[PDB]
């Protein structure tokens, strides 16, 4: 929709700047990273967030997040 997230992601002391709306999925963060950094999403840990439970099937909406987030991939 219209509120939009902002998440900088560190991947080996480089930064990817994801950009997608609340009503998208954690998971759909990692399908972006597979394009970006050509990593399978089977192959990425995707760390970071400030409360348990987040899943890939979580929506960003229900965590209410602010607009910059900072997550981080580990291989």
Known sequence: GSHMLDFRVEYRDRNVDVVLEDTCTVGEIKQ?????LQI?????????????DVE?????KSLHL?????????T
């Open 56 to 60: 890939d099937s979580t929506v960003l």
């Open 40 to 52: 399978p999403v089977s192959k990425m840990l995707l760390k970071g967030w400030k409360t348990g």
């Open 66 to 74: 602010p607009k910059n987030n900072s997550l981080y991939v580990l």
């Open 32 to 36: 972006i990273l597979e394009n970006e």
